[PDB]
Amino acid sequence: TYDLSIISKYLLIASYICSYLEPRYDASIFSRKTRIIQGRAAYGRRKKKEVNP
Amino acid sequence: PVIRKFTKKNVARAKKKYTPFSKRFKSIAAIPDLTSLPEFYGNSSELMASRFENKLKTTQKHQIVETIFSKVKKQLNSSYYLPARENEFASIYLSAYSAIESDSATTIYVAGTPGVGKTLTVREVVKELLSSSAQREIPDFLYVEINGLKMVKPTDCYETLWNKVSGERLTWAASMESLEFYFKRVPKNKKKTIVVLLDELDAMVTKSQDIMYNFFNWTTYENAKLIVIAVANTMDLPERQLGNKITSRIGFTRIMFTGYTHEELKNIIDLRLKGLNDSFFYVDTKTGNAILIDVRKVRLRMSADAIEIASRKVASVSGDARRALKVCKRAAEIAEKHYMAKHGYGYDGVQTVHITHVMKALNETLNSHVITFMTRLSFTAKLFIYALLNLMKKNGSQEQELGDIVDEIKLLIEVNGSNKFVMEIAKTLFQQGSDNISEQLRIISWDFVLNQLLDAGILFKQTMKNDRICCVKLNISVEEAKRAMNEDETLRNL
Amino acid sequence: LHTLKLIATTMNKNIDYLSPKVRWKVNVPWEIIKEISESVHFNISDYFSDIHE
Amino acid sequence: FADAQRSHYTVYPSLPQSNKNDKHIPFVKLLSGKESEVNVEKRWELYHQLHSHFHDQVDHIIDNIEADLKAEISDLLYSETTQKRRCFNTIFLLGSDSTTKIELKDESSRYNVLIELTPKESPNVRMMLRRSMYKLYSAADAEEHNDVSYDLSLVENFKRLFGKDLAMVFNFKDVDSINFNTLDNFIILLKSAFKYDHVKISLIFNINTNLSNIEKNLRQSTIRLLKRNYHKLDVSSNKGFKYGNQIFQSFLDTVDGKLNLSDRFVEFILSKMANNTNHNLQLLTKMLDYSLMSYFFQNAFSVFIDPVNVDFLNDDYLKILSRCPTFMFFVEGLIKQHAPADEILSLLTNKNRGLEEFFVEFLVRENPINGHAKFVARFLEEELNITNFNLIELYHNLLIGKLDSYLDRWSACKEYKDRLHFEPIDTIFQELFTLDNRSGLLTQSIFPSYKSNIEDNLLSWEQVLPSLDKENYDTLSGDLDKIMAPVLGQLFKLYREANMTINIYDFYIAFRETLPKEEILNFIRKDPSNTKLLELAETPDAFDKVALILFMQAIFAFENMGLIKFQSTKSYDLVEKCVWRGI
DNA sequence: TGGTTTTTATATGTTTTGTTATGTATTGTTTATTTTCCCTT
DNA sequence: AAGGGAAAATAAACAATACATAACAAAACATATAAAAACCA
Ligand SMILES: Nc1ncnc2c1ncn2[C@@H]1O[C@H](COP(=O)(O)OP(=O)(O)OP(O)(O)=S)[C@@H](O)[C@H]1O
Ligand SMILES: [Mg+2]
Known part of the structure; x- marks a missing residue:
């Protein structure tokens, strides 16, 4: 559909994630790196929403 | 030529010069004596102002009938010695007699609520001291009417004052430099004293307040011989517009005219009736024409308690002399049309104006008509108000959604289906009478009566294109809307 | 991506990019960002499958 | 009132009397002050004749990308003789920058006005019309050699006031920046000019992104009007790579036989040009210039690409070229093959004549990859009718030796993959005449x-x-x-x-x-x-x-x-x- | 001096642009209650 | 391996802030004509 750049194309994808996922749940989805220092990761959404944002 | 981006084909420009008065004599010592100079101070302008009397003249006149009450209405006009402003005459006349006699300059500020005799008595001040100047006990002066609401632009007062002083037509930016050079630089031996009346000073100062400063600052000059009688409405108009340090520098007098009392209204109305009250006319019985001293010798007295209650009611509200002279003029033509209907004169023992003629003349300007208007609307228009009043007692929100009004009208015909009037009208209000028209969402003439109440001013409606969520206020009151709907027979039972 | 009207802002005349108050949002439909995600072999539907679909 | 607190003040600065020198070039003395002044000014003018020979061809290329685009849009703007004659021919320019001029025909007994509308010139529909009716009335009095209300009643009075029929062309500049409520209502407004029998409208949409984004914005009854005759013309500098392949070939012609391109540099060119798809050719030229600016500023051996300066060769030059890593591999190869010490010693610095006589031998080799890449790009063009290829990644895979592993994707070079085969050989001293980014200057200056x-x-x-x-x-x-x-x-x-x-x-x-x-x-x-x-x-x-x-x-x-x-x-x-x- | 042309002052109209007020929608803040897995045992 | 229990999540009422647009102001852009002012002559 578009002739956008390869990083313009991932920057609309990240724009579509930021604008429909909520900011509260982002640490549960995207975090991958091991913890040197003790801490608890985000638990995620507990129940699904039936609005389809 | 070039291709223009837009056109102005109705420009009409005045033949007004651009150079001010400070650049046509090259020296203050070369300025001549301006009083003994032909085009200054209006010595040739008395020909063109009298041109327009001949335009409205026609030679036909066929014996117009002048009855008893026509002479009273002619004498109660506002255009026709004044009793109740004596200390205010003696304050304006004393302040202006001293400044003309001493070749000085001052400003007199006079305010008050509308209609209290202040434009009348300032003109009566300057007419007294024209007669004093014509007898040579004060020097000659020149008098300029400036009315702020008789101007198109606020800046036209500079043009009209400098035109009356000098006979020259300049633009306004050239007229204020012409006037400012005139008042501070031209010597006092060469000028004449000028009494300018800045009437209705509210209207000139609404946008930029640059105009009230100049006329008052010109009076502080030594060489200026300028008396500004500035008549406005409120008393704080100098201190709000100019400030506190400017209005203390000018040092003007400050008069307020209080509205008249009821005993002062009686000595205005009965003062304009001294030649006609308790007097004899000659009325012929076949045309109706009266002649002051086939024909009866009728006479005319007006009741003194009729003038009393016309004075007690007008002075208690505003106190102006116009509303009392035209509540007695209105009473004099109510009494005429009954005299005109009994005898049938038309147009070609004792007469009186009762207490009931003055009360009838006074009640019609104090009554409201939103009661009488809404009792005689349609059933559809009264059903719109009656549904709106039910919504303002379910919520009290006092602006109802217009789709909540539509569902209320439908619910009110829903519930009252046993009613004798509602069974026979609901056929003629959803299908409009006959078959072949479907049952519909709005009642018949819903767009007619919603626009009828918005045009009348009863109803306020906000601007939304969604015709259902739009909001609707009243503009009259909730009480006088309920008073009009508890009178109608069919709505108060349901 | 903002001059192409693919990222939107709050509408004020002469917004400044360089300000704390200015927030951003995407304006492309789902049917465009689905065509975008299959080009870079990114599975954006799994980020939205777990919220309601 | 200090000048530091003002906005926009102007200094007329004082220049000194004369600084005794004609040293006013920005190049500095290299080798920590051991390089002569005549080398610095030679490296300055040998830069400018290698810089200007590159931009005389790039300016020639850019003038061909517009002369081709003026002519490609003009074959497609004219002569589509429709028999229904009650619509407008629409030209969608896919991916076009709005910097192309459009020349209309002269073509007498007809007026050909071009009306160009930017989204700043289109706040609402009456401003689109009052500018469009001003632009045709001003451009018809220019060809003519009273005033008119600027509205679409000028279109019906055009034969009754000018005697010739009309052919107006609309050129919407940044249609991805205009709002589509206004442009929809203006096409519907121009639809009302199809009852006049002497006019024809032609719309040109410079759609920078996409056609699929535009048809979701316009109303559906407008797209049915735009489809009686439309033409999609892909307009890009990046289509088929055919203009990026000409600028990069023009670069390799200037540095043919005198500079080399490391593959660490070429894939940096190849990666950064993919991150900007709309404006590639200015960004391709910017990276080739700043690397060419970087070479002649930093290498004292930049004066040794014309052979007339090889007769200058000095001692500090001899101490710095011998640390080339290929030169140590050559001395290592002479250790391992030939046992005696004297021929290696005649190569090294204890023979003062031999090492500078050793460097004059290897400057004259053609280093033939620059002509062979032009040989492959021309041969793979006309034989196989292949258009869609980079010459940049063709040159990148040729530096590595992965040429036939790049050519197998077209599946038609199997009969020709043996005759086009080329393994590059590492020439000696090629690190001193090369363009490379192992320090990280181009991704710090241009792309930080x-x-x-x-x-x-x-x-x-x-x-x-x-x-x-x-x-x-x-x-x-x-x-x-x-x-x-x-x-x-x-x-x-x-x-x-x-x-x-x-x-x-x-x-x-x-x-x-x-x-x-x-x-x-x-x-x-x-x-x-x-x-x-x-x-x-x-x-x-x-x-x-x-x-x-x-x-x-x-x-x-x-x-x-x-x-x-x-x-x-x-x-x-x-x-x-x-x-x-x-x- | 004298007519003629050119510029300026005054006057109004047009289009773009930037500011502010406000009603409504969004977002943060606090408090009670429930679920999840890390860190001691 | 079990389990405590604190982090994280949910919900709901309420307060505080942002946002979209209405209404308008003002500057840029534009034209017009009578009066000044050069200016040939
Ligand atoms: N004391 C009075 N004696 C006799 N007639 C009077 C008296 N006061 C007012 N009138 C009459 O009523 C009219 C009212 O005129 P004014 O009251 O002077 O106007 P006004 O005071 O300027 O009210 P404005 O213009 O609204 S501020 C006069 O023209 C007279 O006819
Ligand atoms: Mg008055």
């Missing part, structure tokens, strides 16, 4: 990690300010400089280790504990001259006041850099952090 260079200077700061040892014990604050950070660098590590929302007062106290209490008050007293400053230092409250003054100009400097939000105006007690390192 902007914000990451800001947080690294804030956080680390030892790479920025010189830590000097002798001069500090003389100066006023050098006892303080070894124990105290600069305040923007000290406050940033307190900024970095903190959470999102931070109280200013707790952030003030945490800053204050990092500072040395005794040596700040010793530094504030070491000036004896300011009486007013020594009076602050006698107070018991001196360190607590100096720390706050020094805090709140750095908490101020972090706001207009954009690192700190003041959350919740009316409160002014706590701040939110904007910027994280590493992102």
Whole structure:
């Protein structure tokens, strides 16, 4: 559909994630790196929403 | 030529010069004596102002009938010695007699609520001291009417004052430099004293307040011989517009005219009736024409308690002399049309104006008509108000959604289906009478009566294109809307 | 991506990019960002499958 | 009234009398001041004849990308003789920058006006029409050699006032920036001019992105009007690579036989040109120029690409070329093959004549990859009718030796993959005449990690300010400089280790504990001259006041850099952090 | 001096642009209650 | 391996702030004509 750049194309994808996922749940989805220092990761959404944002 | 981006084909420009008065004599010592100079101070302008009397003249006149009450209405006009402003005459006349006699300059500020005799008595001040100047006990002066609401632009007062002083037509930016050079630089031996009346000073100062400063600052000059009688409405108009340090520098007098009392209204109305009250006319019985001293010798007295209650009611509200002279003029033509209907004169023992003629003349300007208007609307228009009043007692929100009004009208015909009037009208209000028209969402003439109440001013409606969520206020009151709907027979039972 | 009207802002005349108050949002439909995600072999539907679909 | 407090003042600066020299070129003496002045001015003019020979062809190329595009749009704008004759021919220019002029025909007994509309010229529908009717009435009086209301009644009176029929062309410039409510209502407005029998409208849409984005914006009954005759013309500098292949071939013609291109450089060119798809050719030219600017500024051996300067060769040149890594591999090969020491010693610096006679041998080789890549690109063009290929990654895979592993994707070069085969050989001294980025200059000057260079200077700061040892014990604050950070660098590590929302007062106290209490008050007293400053230092409250003054100009400097939000105006007690390192 | 042309002052109209007020929608803040897995045992 | 229990999540009422647009102001852009002012002659 578009002739956008390869990083313009991932920057609309990240724009579509930021604008429909909520900011509260982002640490549960995207975090991958091991913890040197003790801490608890985000638990995620507990129940699904039936609005389809 | 070039291709223009837009056109102005109705420009009409005045033949007004651009150079001010400070650049046509090259020296203050070369300025001549301006009083003994032909085009200054209006010595040739008395020909063109009298041109327009001949335009409205026609030679036909066929014996117009002048009855008893026509002479009273002619004498109660506002255009026709004044009793109740004596200390205010003696304050304006004393302040202006001293400044003309001493070749000085001052400003007199006079305010008050509308209609209290202040434009009348300032003109009566300057007419007294024209007669004093014509007898040579004060020097000659020149008098300029400036009315702020008789101007198109606020800046036209500079043009009209400098035109009356000098006979020259300049633009306004050239007229204020012409006037400012005139008042501070031209010597006092060469000028004449000028009494300018800045009437209705509210209207000139609404946008930029640059105009009230100049006329008052010109009076502080030594060489200026300028008396500004500035008549406005409120008393704080100098201190709000100019400030506190400017209005203390000018040092003007400050008069307020209080509205008249009821005993002062009686000595205005009965003062304009001294030649006609308790007097004899000659009325012929076949045309109706009266002649002051086939024909009866009728006479005319007006009741003194009729003038009393016309004075007690007008002075208690505003106190102006116009509303009392035209509540007695209105009473004099109510009494005429009954005299005109009994005898049938038309147009070609004792007469009186009762207490009931003055009360009838006074009640019609104090009554409201939103009661009488809404009792005689349609059933559809009264059903719109009656549904709106039910919504303002379910919520009290006092602006109802217009789709909540539509569902209320439908619910009110829903519930009252046993009613004798509602069974026979609901056929003629959803299908409009006959078959072949479907049952519909709005009642018949819903767009007619919603626009009828918005045009009348009863109803306020906000601007939304969604015709259902739009909001609707009243503009009259909730009480006088309920008073009009508890009178109608069919709505108060349901 | 903002001059192409693919990222939107709050509408004020002469917004400044360089300000704390200015927030951003995407304006492309789902049917465009689905065509975008299959080009870079990114599975954006799994980020939205777990919220309601 | 200082000039520092004004906006936009003009200095007419004073120039000195004469600085005794014709040294006014920006090139410096290399080899740490061992290079002669005649080498510096030779390297200057040998730069400008290799720079101007590149831009005389690139300006020739860019003038062909418009002369082709004017003619390709004009074959397609004219002669589509429709028999229905009650619509407009629409030209969608896919991916076109709105910087192409359109020449219309002269074509007498007909007026051909071009009406161009930018989205700034289109706030609403009546402003699109009053500019369109002004642009045709002004351009018809220009060809003509009374006033008219500028509306679409000028279109019906056009034969009754000018005698010739009309053919107006609309050129919408940034149609991805216009709003589509206005452009929909203006096409519907122009639809009302199809009853006049002497006009024809032609729309041209410079759609920078996409056609699929446009048909979701217009209403459906307008697209049915735009489809009676439309033509999609793909307009890009990046289509088929045919103009990027000409600028890169024009570069390789200038540096043919005199400069080499490392594959670490070519794939950097290839990667950064993929991150910008709309404006490639200016960015392709920008990277080839700045690397060519970088070569002649930094290499003293830049004067040794024309053979007339080889007769100059000096001793410090002989000490610096022998550390070339291919040259050590050549001496290593002479160790391992030929046992005796003397022929290797005649190669090295103990024979003063032999090494400079060894370098004159290897300058004249053609180094034939530059002509062979032009040979492959022409042969793979006309034989196989292949259009869609980079010459840039063809040159990149040719440097490696992966040529036939790149040609197998077209599946039609199997009968020709043996005759086009070429293994490159490493010539000697090719590191001294080459373009490479192993230092990281092009991705620091042209494509810098902007914000990451800001947080690294804030956080680390030892790479920025010189830590000097002798001069500090003389100066006023050098006892303080070894124990105290600069305040923007000290406050940033307190900024970095903190959470999102931070109280200013707790952030003030945490800053204050990092500072040395005794040596700040010793530094504030070491000036004896300011009486007013020594009076602050006698107070018991001196360190607590100096720390706050020094805090709140750095908490101020972090706001207009954009690192700190003041959350919740009316409160002014706590701040939110904007910027994280590493992102 | 004298007519003629050119510029200026005064006057109004047109289009773009930037500011502010406000009603409604969004977002943060606090308190009670429930689920999840890290860190001690 | 079990389990405590604190972090994280949910919900709901309420307060505080942002946002979209209405209404308008003002500057840029534009034209017109009578009066000044050069200016040939
Ligand atoms: N004391 C009075 N004696 C006799 N007639 C009077 C008296 N006061 C007012 N009138 C009459 O009523 C009219 C009212 O005129 P004014 O009251 O002077 O106007 P006004 O005071 O300027 O009210 P404005 O214009 O609204 S501020 C006069 O023209 C007279 O006819
Ligand atoms: Mg009056």
